[PDB]
A paper describes a structure:
We used cryo–electron microscopy to determine a 2.7 Å structure of AD patient-derived tau paired-helical filaments bound to the PET ligand GTP-1. Using standard helical reconstruction methods, a structure of the PHF was determined with an overall resolution of 2.7 Å and is comprised of two protofilaments related by two-fold symmetry with a 2.37 Å rise and 179.45° twist, consistent with previously reported structures of PHFs prepared from AD brain tissue. The protofilaments form the canonical C-shaped cross-β fold found in AD that is comprised of the 3 R and 4 R tau domains (residues 306–378) and interact laterally via the antiparallel PGGGQ motif (residues 332–336). The overall filament structure is nearly identical to previous structures of AD PHFs (α-carbon RMSD = 0.5 Å). GTP-1 is bound in the cleft comprised of residues 351–360, adjacent to the three-strand β-helix (β5–7) in the protofilament. GTP-1 binds in the C-shaped groove of the PHF filament comprised of strands β6 and β7, which are separated by a kink at Gly355 that creates a concave cleft complementing the convex shape of the GTP-1 stack. We identify that each molecule of GTP-1 binds across three β-strands, making direct contacts with Gln351 in strand 1, Gln351 and Lys353 in strand 2, and Ile360 in strand 3, as well as the backbone between Gln351 and Lys353 in strands 1 and 2. Lys353 lies at the base of the concave binding groove, where it forms a bifurcated hydrogen bond with the benzimidazole nitrogen (2.8 Å N–N distance) and the pyrimido nitrogen (3.4 Å) of GTP-1, satisfying the hydrogen bonding potential of the buried polar atoms within the tricyclic aromatic ring. Examining tau PHF:GTP-1, we observe that the GTP-1 heterocycles are situated at an optimal distance for pi-pi stacking (3.3–3.5 Å), and GTP-1 forms an extended assembly scaffolded by the tau filament, reminiscent of supramolecular polymers that are highly cooperative. Rather than binding to a nondescript surface along a uniform β-sheet, the strong geometric and physical complementarity between GTP-1 and this unique cleft likely imparts considerable specificity for AD filaments.
Residue numbers in the entry:
A (entry chain N), B (entry chain L), C (entry chain J), D (entry chain H), E (entry chain F), F (entry chain D), ...: 306 to 378
The structure:
Amino acid sequence: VQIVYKPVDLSKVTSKCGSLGNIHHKPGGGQVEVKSEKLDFKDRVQSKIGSLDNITHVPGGGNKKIETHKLTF
Amino acid sequence: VQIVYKPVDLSKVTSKCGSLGNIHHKPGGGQVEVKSEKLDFKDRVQSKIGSLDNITHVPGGGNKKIETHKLTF
Amino acid sequence: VQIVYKPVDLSKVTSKCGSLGNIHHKPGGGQVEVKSEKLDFKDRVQSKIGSLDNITHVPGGGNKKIETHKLTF
Amino acid sequence: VQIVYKPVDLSKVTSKCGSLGNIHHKPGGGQVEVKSEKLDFKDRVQSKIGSLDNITHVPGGGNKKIETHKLTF
Amino acid sequence: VQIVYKPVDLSKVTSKCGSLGNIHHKPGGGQVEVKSEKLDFKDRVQSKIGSLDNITHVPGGGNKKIETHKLTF
Amino acid sequence: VQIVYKPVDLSKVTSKCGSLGNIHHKPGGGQVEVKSEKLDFKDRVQSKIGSLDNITHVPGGGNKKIETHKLTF
Amino acid sequence: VQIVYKPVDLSKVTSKCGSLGNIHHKPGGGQVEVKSEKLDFKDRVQSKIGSLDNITHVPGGGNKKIETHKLTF
Amino acid sequence: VQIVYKPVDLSKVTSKCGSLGNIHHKPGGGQVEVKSEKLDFKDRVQSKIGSLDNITHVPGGGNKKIETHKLTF
Amino acid sequence: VQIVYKPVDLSKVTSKCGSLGNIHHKPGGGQVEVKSEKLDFKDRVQSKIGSLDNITHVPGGGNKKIETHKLTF
Amino acid sequence: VQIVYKPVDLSKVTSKCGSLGNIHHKPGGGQVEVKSEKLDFKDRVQSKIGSLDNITHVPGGGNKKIETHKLTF
Amino acid sequence: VQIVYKPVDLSKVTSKCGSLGNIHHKPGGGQVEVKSEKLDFKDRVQSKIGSLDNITHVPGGGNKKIETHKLTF
Amino acid sequence: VQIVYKPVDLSKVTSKCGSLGNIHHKPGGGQVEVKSEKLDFKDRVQSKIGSLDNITHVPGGGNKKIETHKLTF
Amino acid sequence: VQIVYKPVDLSKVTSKCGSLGNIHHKPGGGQVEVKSEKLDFKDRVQSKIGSLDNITHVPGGGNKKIETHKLTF
Amino acid sequence: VQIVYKPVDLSKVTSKCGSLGNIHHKPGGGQVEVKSEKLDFKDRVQSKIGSLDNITHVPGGGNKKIETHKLTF
Amino acid sequence: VQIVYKPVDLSKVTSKCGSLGNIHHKPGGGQVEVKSEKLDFKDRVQSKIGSLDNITHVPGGGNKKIETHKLTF
Amino acid sequence: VQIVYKPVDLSKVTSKCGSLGNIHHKPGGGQVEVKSEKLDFKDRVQSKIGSLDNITHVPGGGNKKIETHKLTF
Amino acid sequence: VQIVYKPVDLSKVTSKCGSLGNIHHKPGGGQVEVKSEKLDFKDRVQSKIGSLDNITHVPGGGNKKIETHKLTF
Amino acid sequence: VQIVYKPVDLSKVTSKCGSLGNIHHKPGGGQVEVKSEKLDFKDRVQSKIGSLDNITHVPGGGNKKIETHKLTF
Amino acid sequence: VQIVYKPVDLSKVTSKCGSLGNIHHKPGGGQVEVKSEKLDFKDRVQSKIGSLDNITHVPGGGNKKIETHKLTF
Amino acid sequence: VQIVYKPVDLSKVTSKCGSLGNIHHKPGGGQVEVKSEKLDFKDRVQSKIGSLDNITHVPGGGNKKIETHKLTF
Amino acid sequence: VQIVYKPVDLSKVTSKCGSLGNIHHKPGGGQVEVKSEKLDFKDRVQSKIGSLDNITHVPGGGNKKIETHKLTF
Amino acid sequence: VQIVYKPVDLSKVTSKCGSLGNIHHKPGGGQVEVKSEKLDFKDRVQSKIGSLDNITHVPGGGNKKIETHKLTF
Amino acid sequence: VQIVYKPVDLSKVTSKCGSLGNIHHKPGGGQVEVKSEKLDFKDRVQSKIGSLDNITHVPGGGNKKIETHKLTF
Ligand SMILES: FCCC1CCN(c2ccn3c(n2)nc2ccccc23)CC1
Ligand SMILES: FCCC1CCN(c2ccn3c(n2)nc2ccccc23)CC1
Ligand SMILES: FCCC1CCN(c2ccn3c(n2)nc2ccccc23)CC1
Ligand SMILES: FCCC1CCN(c2ccn3c(n2)nc2ccccc23)CC1
Ligand SMILES: FCCC1CCN(c2ccn3c(n2)nc2ccccc23)CC1
Ligand SMILES: FCCC1CCN(c2ccn3c(n2)nc2ccccc23)CC1
Ligand SMILES: FCCC1CCN(c2ccn3c(n2)nc2ccccc23)CC1
Ligand SMILES: FCCC1CCN(c2ccn3c(n2)nc2ccccc23)CC1
Ligand SMILES: FCCC1CCN(c2ccn3c(n2)nc2ccccc23)CC1
Ligand SMILES: FCCC1CCN(c2ccn3c(n2)nc2ccccc23)CC1
Ligand SMILES: FCCC1CCN(c2ccn3c(n2)nc2ccccc23)CC1
Ligand SMILES: FCCC1CCN(c2ccn3c(n2)nc2ccccc23)CC1
Ligand SMILES: FCCC1CCN(c2ccn3c(n2)nc2ccccc23)CC1
Ligand SMILES: FCCC1CCN(c2ccn3c(n2)nc2ccccc23)CC1
Ligand SMILES: FCCC1CCN(c2ccn3c(n2)nc2ccccc23)CC1
Ligand SMILES: FCCC1CCN(c2ccn3c(n2)nc2ccccc23)CC1
């Protein structure tokens, strides 16, 4: 039995910008209320219970390249 | 038995912009109310219970290239 | 038995823009109410129970290229 | 037995724009009410129970190219 | 037995625009009410129970090219 | 036995526009009420129970090209 | 046995427009009421129970080209 | 039995920007309230119960390249 | 039995920027309240109960390259 | 039995910036209150109960390269 | 049985910056209150109960390269 | 000259009801448009130009008694 | 000259009700548009230009008694 | 000359109710637009230009008694 | 000349209620827009230009008694 | 000349209630926009330009008695 | 000339209530925008330009008695 | 000439209540924006330009008695 | 000439309450922005330009009695 | 000429309360911004420009009695 | 000429309370920004420019009695 | 000419309280910024420019009695 | 000419309290910044420029009685 695995990749994820500019993020605070009694979490459970979050993500150049090579017998 | 795997990729995910400009995000805070009794989470469960979230994602250049190579016997 | 797998790809996902401009996002906060008793989640379940979320996604250049190569015996 | 797999692709998903312009998103907050008793989720179930969400997606250049190569024996 | 698979593709999904212009989205918040007792979800079920959502998708250049190559024995 | 599969495609899905213009979307919020008791969903069921949604999709250049190549033995 | 499959396609789905213009969408919110008791969904069933939705789809250039190549033995 | 695994990658995730500009993040503090009785967490569970968080992520140049090579016998 | 594992990688995750600029982060302090009785955490559980956190991450040049090589017998 | 493991990597995670600029972080102190009775932590549990934290991370040049080589018999 | 393990790495995590600039961090002191009764910690548990912490991390040049080589029999 | 004015009134405007009951008012929002150029109002003029009004007047007991006594010389 | 004015009134405007009941007012928001150029109001003029108003007046007991006594020489 | 003015009034505007009940007012927000150029108001003019108002007046006991005594020479 | 003015009033504006009950006022926020150029107000003019107001007036016992005694020579 | 002014008043504006009850006021925030150029106000003019106001007036016992005695020569 | 002014008043504005109850006021924050150029106010002018105000007036016992005695020669 | 002024008043503005109860006021912060150029105020002008105010006035016993005695020659 | 002024007043503004109760005021901080150029105030002008104020006025017993006696020659 | 001024007042502004109770005032800090150029104040002008103020006025017994006696020749 | 001025006052502004109770004032610090150029104040002008003030006024017994006696010739 | 001025006052501003109780004032420090250029103050002008002040005024017994006697010729 | 001035006052401003109790004042330090260039103060001007002050005024018995007697010729 013979196996060959030679994937070739040559990619350019380019990102050119002159100038983003004046970005404003002025949220008004709200109100959040959560009421529970019992929590039982197991086996890779990620939770977010009760949140008032503000994020201003302004990256000059945003590029994500994902490659998942796999091989099984 | 013989196997060959030589996928060739040559791609340019280009992104050109002169200038984004004046971006404004001025939300007014609302109200959220959640009421529960029991929670039972298992086996890769991700939850978001109660949220008032504001996000201003302004990346100059947004490009995501996903490649999933697989091979099984 | 002989197998050959040589897919060739050469693609340019171009994106040219002069200037986005003045983008405004001024939402008025509403009201959300959720009432439950019992939750039982399992086996790759993602939930969003109760949310008042505002997002302003303004990426200069948006391009996503997905390739899923597979091969099984 | 002999197998050959040489798909050739050469595509340009072009996107040219001079300037988007003045985009405004001014929603008025409404009201949402959800009432349940029991939830039982399993086996790749994604839910959204109770939401008042506003999104302003303004990407300069929007282009998604999907290719799903498969081969089975 | 002999098999050959050489599909050739050469396509240009062009998109040219001078300027989008002044786009306005000013919805008035309504009211939504959902009342249930029991939920039982399984095996690739995605639900949206109770929503008041506003989206302003204004991408300069919108082009999606889908190719699904398959081959089975 | 011999098999040949060489489909050739060369297509240009062009889209030219000078300027979209002033687009306005000013809906008045209505009222929605849904009342149920039991839900039992299985095997690739996607539902939308209770919604008051407004969308303003204004892409400069809208072009989708779908190709589904298949081959079975 | 011999098989040949060489379909040739060369098509231009052109779309030229000078300027769309002033498009207005001003709906008045109505009222919707749905009343049920039991729901049992299975095997690729997609439902929309209770909706008051407004959409303003104004793409400069709308062109969709679908090709379904098939071959079976 | 023979196995070969020589994947070649040569990719440039470029990110060019002239100047980001004046970015402002002025959120108004809201209110969050969470009430529970018992918590039972196990086996890779990460939770966030009660949060009012503001983040201003402005990286000049944002590029993440992920490669997951795997091989099993 | 013979095994070879020679993956070659040559990638440049470049990030060029002229000058970020004047970045301001002026949040207004809110209020957070969490009330529980018993906590039982085990087996790789990370929690964040009660937080009012502000972060201004402004790295000139942000680039993360992840490679996970694996091999099992 | 023979095994070879010679992965070659040659990557440059470059980060060039002219000058970050005037970065300001002026948060207003909020209020946090957490109330519990009993805590029982075990087996790699990291918690953060009650926090009002401000961080201004401004590194000139941010680049993290992670490589996880593994091999098992 | 023979085993070879010769991974070669040659990477330059460069970070160039002209001058960071005037960075200001002027937080306003808030208030934090935590109330508990009993704590029981064991087996690699790190906790942070009650904190009002301010950090200004401004390193000229931030670059972390992690390599985890492993080999087991 | 002699004048006498002694009007005697003794009236009971009774209103008895056991229970009104379940009264529902669920109008569907219409559309109104008024276009004018000049308005000139004087000397006890009350106007209502442009209205979409809903009123649910349910008074338990409705009784109005009007008496206009007058006398002139 | 002699004048006498002795009007006697003895009236009971009674209103008895056991219980009003469940009154519901669920209007759907419409749309109103008014366009004018010049307004000139004088001398006891009350106007209402542009209104979308909902009122639910449910007074237990509604009784108004008006008496206008006058006398002139 | 002689004048006498002795009006006698003895009235009971009674209002009895057992219990109003469950009153609900759930309007859906509409849209109002008013456009003018010049306004000139004088001499006891009260105006309401542009309004979306909701009122729920539920007074237990509503009774207004008006008496206007006048006398002139 | 002789004048006498002895109006006698003896009135009981009674208001009895057992219990109002559960009153709910859940309006959905609409949208209001007013556009003018010049305003000239004089001589007892009260205006309300642009309003989205919600009022829930629930007074236990509502009774207003107005008496306007006048006398002139 | 002789003048007499002896108006006698003896009135009881009673208001009895057992218990108001559970009153809820949950409005959803809308949006208001007013645009003017010049304002000229004089001589007892009270204005309200631009308002989104919510009031919950629940006085146990509401009774206003107005008496305007006047006399002129 | 002789003048007499002896108005007698004996009034009881009573207000009895057992218990108001659970009153809730949970408004959702909206958005207000006012734009003007010049303001010229004189001679007893009170204005309110731009307001988002919430008031919960719950006085146990509300009674206002106004008497305006006047006399002129 | 003779003048007499002996107005007699004997009034009891009573207010009895057993217990107000649980009153809650949880508004969600909105957003207000006012833009002007010149202000010219004179001669008893009180203004409120730009306000987001919340008031919870809960006085046990609210009673205001106003008497304005006047006399002129 | 003779003048007499002997107004007699005997009034009891009573206020009785058993116990107010649990009053809560939990507003969510909004956002206010005011922009002007010139201010010119004179002659008894009181202004409030820019305010985000919260007040919880809970006086046990609220009673204000105003008497304005006047006399002129 | 003779003048007499003997106004008699005998009033009891009583205020009785058993116990106020648990009063809570937990506002969330918002954001205020005021921008002006020139201020010119004269002749009894009191201003408040820029304020984020919280007051909890809880006086046991609130009673203000104002009397303004005047007399002029 | 003769003048007499003998106003008699005998008033008891009583205030009785059993016990105020547990009063809490926990505001969250906001943010205030004021920007001006020139200030010119004269002739009894009191100003407050820029303030974030919290006051908890809890006086057991609050009673203010104001009397302004005046007399002029 | 004769003048008499004998105003008699006999008033008891009583204030009785059993015990105030547990009063807490826990504000969270905010942020204040004021920017000016020139200040010119004259003729009884009191100003407060820039303040973050907390006051807890809890006087057992608060009573202020003001009397302003005046007399002029 | 004769003048008499014999105002008699006999007032008791009483203040009785059993015990104030546990009063706590725990403010969190904020931040204040004031920036000016020139100050010119004259003629009874008192200013407070830049202050972060905390005061806990708890006087057992607070009573201020002000009397301003005046007389002029
Ligand atoms: F289960 C706990 C972890 C989950 C929930 C929290 N995360 C996110 C991530 C992104 N978004 C988001 N939430 N809400 C969003 C609203 C609009 C746009 C993007 C949004 C991470 C995943
Ligand atoms: F089942 C939970 C996940 C589902 C439901 C939520 N998602 C979406 C995505 C898109 N849209 C949407 N909802 N509503 C829409 C209305 C108009 C236009 C687009 C819309 C993701 C899929
Ligand atoms: F089952 C849960 C996931 C489903 C339902 C939600 N999604 C969508 C997507 C698009 N639209 C939509 N809903 N409603 C629409 C109305 C008009 C136009 C487009 C619309 C995603 C699929
Ligand atoms: F369990 C006790 C040890 C834990 C908790 C404390 N640590 C940290 C570390 C980083 N961050 C953080 N906390 N909070 C953050 C908020 C924003 C951004 C970064 C933040 C170390 C890990
Ligand atoms: F000119 C400005 C003042 C006018 C117009 C507004 N008012 C009203 C009052 C009552 N109704 C009404 N409008 N429309 C109605 C429709 C049905 C039933 C009753 C209605 C007060 C008087
Ligand atoms: F000119 C400015 C003042 C006018 C107009 C506004 N007012 C009102 C009052 C009552 N109603 C009303 N408008 N519209 C209504 C619709 C149905 C029922 C009652 C209604 C007060 C008078
Ligand atoms: F000109 C500025 C002052 C005017 C207009 C505003 N006021 C009101 C008062 C009452 N209502 C009202 N408006 N609209 C209403 C709709 C339905 C029912 C009652 C209504 C006070 C008078
Ligand atoms: F001109 C500036 C002063 C005017 C306008 C503002 N005021 C009010 C008062 C009462 N209402 C009202 N507006 N709108 C209303 C809608 C429904 C019911 C009652 C209403 C006070 C008078
Ligand atoms: F001109 C500046 C002063 C005016 C306007 C502000 N005031 C008010 C007072 C009462 N209300 C009101 N506005 N709007 C209202 C809506 C519904 C019910 C009552 C309302 C005081 C008078
Ligand atoms: F011109 C500057 C002074 C004016 C305006 C501010 N004041 C008020 C007073 C009361 N209310 C109000 N505004 N808005 C309100 C809304 C609903 C109910 C009551 C309301 C005092 C008078
Ligand atoms: F011109 C500067 C002085 C004016 C404006 C500020 N004042 C007030 C007073 C009371 N209220 C108010 N504003 N807004 C309110 C909203 C609802 C209820 C009551 C309200 C005092 C008078
Ligand atoms: F011009 C500078 C002096 C003026 C403005 C500041 N003052 C006040 C006083 C009372 N209130 C208020 N403002 N805003 C309020 C909102 C709701 C209720 C009461 C309110 C004192 C008078
Ligand atoms: F011009 C500088 C002096 C003025 C302004 C400052 N003062 C006040 C006084 C009282 N309040 C207030 N401001 N704001 C308030 C908000 C709600 C309730 C009461 C309020 C004193 C007078
Ligand atoms: F011009 C400089 C002197 C002025 C301003 C400062 N003073 C005050 C006094 C009282 N308050 C206040 N400010 N702000 C307040 C907010 C709520 C309640 C009461 C308040 C004294 C007068
Ligand atoms: F101009 C310089 C002298 C002025 C300003 C400083 N003083 C004060 C006095 C009282 N208060 C105050 N400031 N701010 C306050 C906030 C809330 C309550 C009371 C307050 C004395 C007068
Ligand atoms: F101009 C320099 C002298 C002035 C300013 C300083 N003084 C004060 C006095 C009292 N207070 C105050 N400042 N700030 C306060 C805040 C809250 C309550 C009371 C306060 C004395 C007068």
